[PDB]
Design an enzyme around this catalytic site. Structure first.
Site, PDB file in Angstrom:
ATOM      1  N   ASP I  90      29.147 -17.644  -0.052  1.00 37.25           N
ATOM      2  CA  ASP I  90      29.756 -18.917   0.171  1.00 37.25           C
ATOM      3  C   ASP I  90      30.076 -19.496  -1.022  1.00 37.25           C
ATOM      4  OD1 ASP I  90      30.076 -21.284   1.269  1.00 37.25           O
ATOM      5  OD2 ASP I  90      28.110 -21.786   1.341  1.00 37.25           O
ATOM      6  N   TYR I  91      31.042 -20.482  -1.107  1.00 34.54           N
ATOM      7  CA  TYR I  91      31.749 -21.146  -2.367  1.00 34.54           C
ATOM      8  C   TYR I  91      30.660 -22.090  -2.815  1.00 34.54           C
ATOM      9  CZ  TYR I  91      33.747 -25.889  -2.383  1.00 34.54           C
ATOM     10  OH  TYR I  91      33.984 -27.254  -2.541  1.00 34.54           O
ATOM     11  N   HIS I  92      29.867 -22.465  -1.909  1.00 28.58           N
ATOM     12  CA  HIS I  92      28.894 -23.586  -2.375  1.00 28.58           C
ATOM     13  C   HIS I  92      27.507 -22.702  -2.691  1.00 28.58           C
ATOM     14  CE1 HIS I  92      29.302 -27.458  -3.504  1.00 28.58           C
ATOM     15  NE2 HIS I  92      29.842 -28.028  -2.352  1.00 28.58           N
TER      16      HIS I  92
END
Ligand SMILES: [Mg+2]
Ligand SMILES: [Mg+2]
Ligand SMILES: [Mg+2]
Ligand SMILES: [Mg+2]
Ligand SMILES: [Mg+2]
Ligand SMILES: [Mg+2]
Ligand SMILES: [Mg+2]
Ligand SMILES: [Mg+2]
Ligand SMILES: [Mg+2]
Ligand SMILES: [Mg+2]
Ligand SMILES: [Zn+2]
Lengths: 155, 128, 60, 118, 82, 206, 99, 25, 92
Positions: I90-92
RNA sequence: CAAGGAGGUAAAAAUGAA
RNA sequence: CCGGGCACUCUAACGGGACUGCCCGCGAAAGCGGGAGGAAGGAGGGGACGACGUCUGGUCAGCAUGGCCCUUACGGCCUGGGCGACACACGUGCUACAAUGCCCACUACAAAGCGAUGCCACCCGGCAACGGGGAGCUAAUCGCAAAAAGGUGGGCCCAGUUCGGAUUGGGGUCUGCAACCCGACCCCAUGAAGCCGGAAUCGCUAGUAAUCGCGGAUCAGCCAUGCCGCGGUGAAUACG
């Protein structure tokens, strides 16, 4: 930030003596909260004092504490990433605590076999001014002695 | 033979103290105030309120005890002995207060709280 | 495997040790109290609802 | 006294001195001296030679002990040599026999750590 | 560790006993260690399931309390980088 | 956030139970399942009444069931149906004394379950939620309330972004024990998901 | 001779309903041993507060089951008459046995 | 020796009884 | 050549063609990316604009990250013509 | 008693995330 | 144990009981310090109670539910395997390295809870686990339980040692259809590493830390040294 100056804890006086001091010593002997074994060891050692010397343990123990009392100790303080060690005086409360603590520790440092004979002997040695605790006391006063330079930082 | 109140409690311990006016400084329950409490140094501190007063064995002790362990029972006995001599001697109040032999001492074992390992001891961690 | 799995939990034949508890309100197989026949999750829900006779918050 | 294959334990209680033999332990110890009829709290220092003879004769016989039963034990592990079971392979690889956790621990059979790093 | 039971699979034994009169062929499988080594039909091979396939294990005395699947490891391991 | 169910927080003092019967083990489990299946079966074909409560009492094969409703319009005079086999269909897995009563909740604007349910209907009617919240609160406050608070959370007006609409007039002290605070909740089923409506109604106590 | 026991989850309903039977037995010609408070059997259980997996900090509940005893002397059908089927509980379980 | 199965102390800790800790009298 | 997986869903899509570990609409997407990471003889080949390639920083140093869709990234370590530890994160 | 203007000022501790 | 009695203890239901109200001093007040007042005090000691909001925090595997996908199958049944793998790395722990200690015997002192599809007194076999019997108990009645640390007695005598218990052989028992992978105990024999911990790192301010045992949930059994509770003995120190 110590808003309260933390009042001095008071103890219960012992049996047969009435000491306001001996119980504090028995407490240091005490491990794991067994005051029975602790008190027994001291009174045992008191019986041991009677043998090797014809003196009442109430004075032998009393004088021993008096001989293992740090007049002044070294205190690490301010400026320079806490670089200094100001030699400070020792409060009667702290002399009290150090005396009994060093006694028991030096007592268990001895090569003897029984806890009672260690206590008895270390007390007799300390009453004379010979104990390993007296070494510790005299050592702590050496450190305090060698730092009289920046002692004027005081506080 | 006789009766003198008796309600001493300390940390889940119950002790009913009587005392019967007689020179025989006696015991109760199992065996002697000794015997039943032998090897225990602080056991004889329960008789200190008698030393605080003028009782060098003027009473015949009779204390049935229950609950807790010895030390609490001994503590409770102290509260019961004092509760007796203060009862049939209302003027013996002016020694149970300065010496403080009259207090239930609410100091009791604190509850195991969840999360913590025991009462207050936190379970210890590392960030990494 | 969830629908055919809450089937077996009530079916209970073939060897007595193959039978197991199972929350009725849910289908939870873990933390199932025998007393209520519920999982710890459902039990908390209904206890706050008030639909659990006598069941009350514990403060001491 | 050279009881079985050993002799070592001098002045140290026969019920204890006996223990110093692979095959005796603690239970067979007092069992042997009550059956031989000897005082357990004795000196072990070469006491009554007769008691020592009876003790030796009973102990060294009766049950297998010392180097002989070490050989038997090693041979019982050699049982799972041939085309043996699963328990044999655990004696082969040097891993714990009773199927325990080997992800960590098991150092008493694996030995000290080797550290691979990656 | 049983004592008054000491059991073998009935279905393993059914197949094993009705193929034991005056001789047989070593073609015999199973699906359960659960059983026990069984004396008689010692000179036999029992293809035990290890979870993946049927391993021909061979009986030559020596074995008893060890049922079957101890002679049929289920894992492989083989090595750890080395 | 994290706050305890204001109903469970009372239970003892203020706000009594909802299923009041006593049993020991070997019975509690069975009777609780039956009890819950009654609540489950009633809720279905009685929602049009809008039921504030479903009180239940027992006394060995006695099973009393009190259904509180704003408007008991779905009872219709004795043999006019809507009760006969309806209160008798319970005993198709019970067979015990299906004593079904009906209560008249006077003011629905002071019944938290009814308030939240009216709001949750409006969400599914595709109403403007923020305006619906405001009105419902004032509506509750208009009918003599000492304090009110409605909360809708998540996916407001569709639109990809979970929100939380908040409105509350007067006084609502949740921390106080002598509170008399009614709590209701409702699921609004939408073609774009599910959102929850909380409703708090408060009156004095002491 | 007649022994009656009253168990209950709610103490206020018990302490009241088992006091009715002290009045309904005393004013009918008998000696009645009053509300005997048998000790309670507290049945606690502790559940993790979250549906997820937050082991520390949960929340527990208890189910207190109260017991109360009352004894009446002579089993005359004068006192029996009233305590026969004039029962007013809310589900409170009652046990009636004579020994 | 709280983990030795041949002591009254280890038998306590383990819970179980036996020869090194009889079921009283 | 892809040599090791960290994500089970990713592992199954490339090996057996098992698509039930990834989103259903990202099946074709993830596939073309994995084949690219498989055929890549050097990190320079995994440089098409639609991948938004870049090495990670901090504790994730030594790793790389091409973009599947939205906030979703396939991370790995590329070394000597091979990728290792293929993850789906995930990008976060 | 109530301060204006005067002057010696921290340490060794760098970076940033996709 | 009975007669009888229930004042004590206890049991559990409503109450009383301090609100720094009273004294000295400080102060404009709030309040602060100090003192007899009592069991208690200047929120008495612990719980339950977590504001607006923050972390695109956590959870589609408790459950609910929008969308995407699978349907002779991404569903359904079964036997078996696996989650227990092991060259290694980290977390939380348990048991220790001993003589304020260990073993054996005797002998006391708890609380909080659980049990008649169970707890199982007392006898009998057995070194023992346990098995045969079999009384009481819908349980402040009977049972689980003797609490353990303590005390008394005696033995080891400082030694990898009567410290330490790992690992391994053998022999058994109990649940279970079945315990090889992978169960808990019992008994015999082995008796390893460890003689007190590098850089670092944690907890606790009064019944508290330490130490000691006891119950319960789950549960046929149990890998529980865990979690949630219960009481026993009981420190040290806070200048700042
Ligand atoms: Mg404690
Ligand atoms: Mg934890
Ligand atoms: Mg740089
Ligand atoms: Mg508050
Ligand atoms: Mg997220
Ligand atoms: Mg789902
Ligand atoms: Mg696992
Ligand atoms: Mg060594
Ligand atoms: Mg040593
Ligand atoms: Mg604090
Ligand atoms: Zn559930």
């Amino acid at each position: 930030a110590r808003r309260r100056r933390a009042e001095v804890r008071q103890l219960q006086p012992d049996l047969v003596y009435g000491d306001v001091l001996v119980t504090a010593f028995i407490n240091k002997i005490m491990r794991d909260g067994k005051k029975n074994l602790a008190a027994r060891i001291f009174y045992d050692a008191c019986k041991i004092i009677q043998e090797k010397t014809g003196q009442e343990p109430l004075k032998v123990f009393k004088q021993a504490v008096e001989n293992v009392k740090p007049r002044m100790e070294v205190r690490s303080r301010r400026v320079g990433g806490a670089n200094y060690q100001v030699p400070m005086e020792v409060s009667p409360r702290r002399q009290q605590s150090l005396a009994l603590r060093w006694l028991v520790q030096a007592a268990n440092q001895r090569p003897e076999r029984r806890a009672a004979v260690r206590i008895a002997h270390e007390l007799m040695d300390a009453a004379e001014g010979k104990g390993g605790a007296v070494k510790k006391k005299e050592d702590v006063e050496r450190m305090a002695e060698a730092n009289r330079a920046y002692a004027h930082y005081r506080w | 033979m006789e009766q003198y109140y008796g309600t001493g409690r300390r940390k889940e311990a119950v002790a009913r103290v009587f005392l019967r006016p007689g020179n025989g400084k006696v015991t109760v329950n199992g065996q002697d105030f000794n015997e039943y409490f032998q090897g225990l140094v602080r056991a004889v501190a329960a008789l200190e309120p008698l030393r605080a007063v003028d009782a060098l064995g003027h009473f015949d002790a009779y204390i049935t005890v229950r609950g807790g362990g010895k030390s609490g029972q001994i503590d409770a006995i102290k509260l019961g002995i004092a509760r007796a001599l203060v009862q049939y001697n209302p003027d013996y109040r002016a020694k149970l207060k300065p010496l403080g032999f009259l207090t239930r001492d609410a100091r009791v074992v604190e509850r195991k709280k969840y999360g913590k390992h025991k009462a207050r001891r936190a379970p210890q961690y590392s960030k990494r | 495997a969830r629908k055919a799995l809450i089937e077996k939990a009530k079916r209970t034949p073939k060897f007595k040790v193959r039978a197991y508890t199972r929350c009725v309100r849910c289908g939870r197989a873990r933390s199932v109290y025998r007393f209520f026949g519920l999982c710890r999750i459902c039990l908390r829900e209904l206890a706050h609802k008030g639909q659990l006779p006598g069941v009350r918050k514990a403060s001491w | 006294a050279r009881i079985a294959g050993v002799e070592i334990p001098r002045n140290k209680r026969v019920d204890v001195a006996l223990t110093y033999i692979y095959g005796i332990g603690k239970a067979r110890a007092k069992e042997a001296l009550e059956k031989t009829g000897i005082n357990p709290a004795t000196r072990v220092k070469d006491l009554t030679e007769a008691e020592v003879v009876r003790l030796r004769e009973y102990v060294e016989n009766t049950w297998k002990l010392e180097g002989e039963l070490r050989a038997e034990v090693a041979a019982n592990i050699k049982r799972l040599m041939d085309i043996g079971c699963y328990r044999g392979l655990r004696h082969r690889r040097g891993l714990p026999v009773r199927g325990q956790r080997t992800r960590t621990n098991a150092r008493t059979r694996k030995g000290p750590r080797k550290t691979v790093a990656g | 560790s049983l004592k008054k039971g000491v059991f073998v699979d009935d279905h393993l034994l059914e197949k094993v006993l009705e193929l034991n009169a005056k001789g047989e062929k070593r073609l015999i499988k199973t699906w359960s260690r659960r059983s026990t080594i069984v004396p008689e039909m010692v000179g036999h091979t029992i293809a035990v399931y290890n979870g993946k396939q049927h391993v021909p294990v061979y009986i030559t005395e020596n074995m008893v309390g060890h049922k079957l699947g101890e002679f049929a490891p289920t894992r492989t391991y083989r090595g750890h980088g080395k | 956030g994290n706050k305890i169910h204001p109903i469970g927080f009372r239970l003892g003092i203020t706000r009594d139970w909802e299923s009041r019967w006593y049993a020991g083990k070997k019975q509690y489990r069975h009777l609780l399942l039956e009890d819950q299946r009654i609540r489950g079966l009633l809720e279905k074909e009685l929602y049009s009444a809008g039921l504030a409560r479903v009180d239940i009492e027992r006394a060995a094969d006695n099973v009393a069931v009190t259904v509180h409703v704003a408007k008991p319009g779905v009872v219709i005079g004795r043999g006019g149906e809507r009760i006969r086999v309806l209160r008798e269909e319970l005993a198709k897995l019970t067979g015990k004394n299906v004593a079904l009563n009906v209560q008249e909740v006077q003011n629905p604007n002071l019944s938290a379950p009814l308030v939240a349910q009216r709001v949750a209907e409006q969400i599914e009617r595709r109403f403007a939620v923020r305006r619906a919240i405001k009105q419902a609160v004032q509506r509750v406050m208009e009918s003599g309330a000492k304090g009110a608070k409605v909360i809708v959370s998540g996916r407001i007006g569709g639109a990809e972004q979970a929100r939380t609409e908040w409105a509350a007039q007067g006084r609502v002290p949740l921390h106080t024990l002598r509170a008399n605070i009614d709590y209701g909740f409702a699921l609004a089923r939408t073609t774009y998901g599910v959102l929850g409506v909380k409703a708090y109604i408060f009156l004095g106590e002491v | 001779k007649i022994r009656i026991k009253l168990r209950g989850f709610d103490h206020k309903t018990l302490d009241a309903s088992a006091q009715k039977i002290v009045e309904a037995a005393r004013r009918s010609g008998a000696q009645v041993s009053g509300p005997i408070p048998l000790p309670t059997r507290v049945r606690r259980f502790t559940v993790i507060r979250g549906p997820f997996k937050h082991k520390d900090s949960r929340e527990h509940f208890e189910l207190r089951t109260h017991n109360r005893l009352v004894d009446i002397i002579n089993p005359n059908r004068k006192t029996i008459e009233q305590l026969m089927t004039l029962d007013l509980p809310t589900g409170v379980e009652i046990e009636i046995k004579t020994v | 020796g709280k983990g030795d199965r041949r002591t009254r102390r280890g038998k306590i800790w383990r819970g179980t009884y036996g020869k090194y800790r009889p079921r009283k009298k | 050549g892809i040599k090791s997986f960290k994500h089970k869903g990713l592992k199954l899509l490339f090996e057996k063609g098992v698509t039930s570990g990834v989103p259903a609409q990202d099946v074709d997407r993830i596939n073309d990316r994995l084949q690219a990471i498989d055929t890549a003889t050097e990190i320079g080949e995994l440089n098409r604009q639609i991948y938004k390639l870049h090495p990670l920083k901090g504790d994730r140093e030594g790793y790389w990250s091409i973009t599947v869709r939205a906030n979703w990234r396939i991370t790995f370590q590329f070394i000597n013509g091979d990728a290792y530890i293929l993850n789906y994160e995930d990008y976060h």
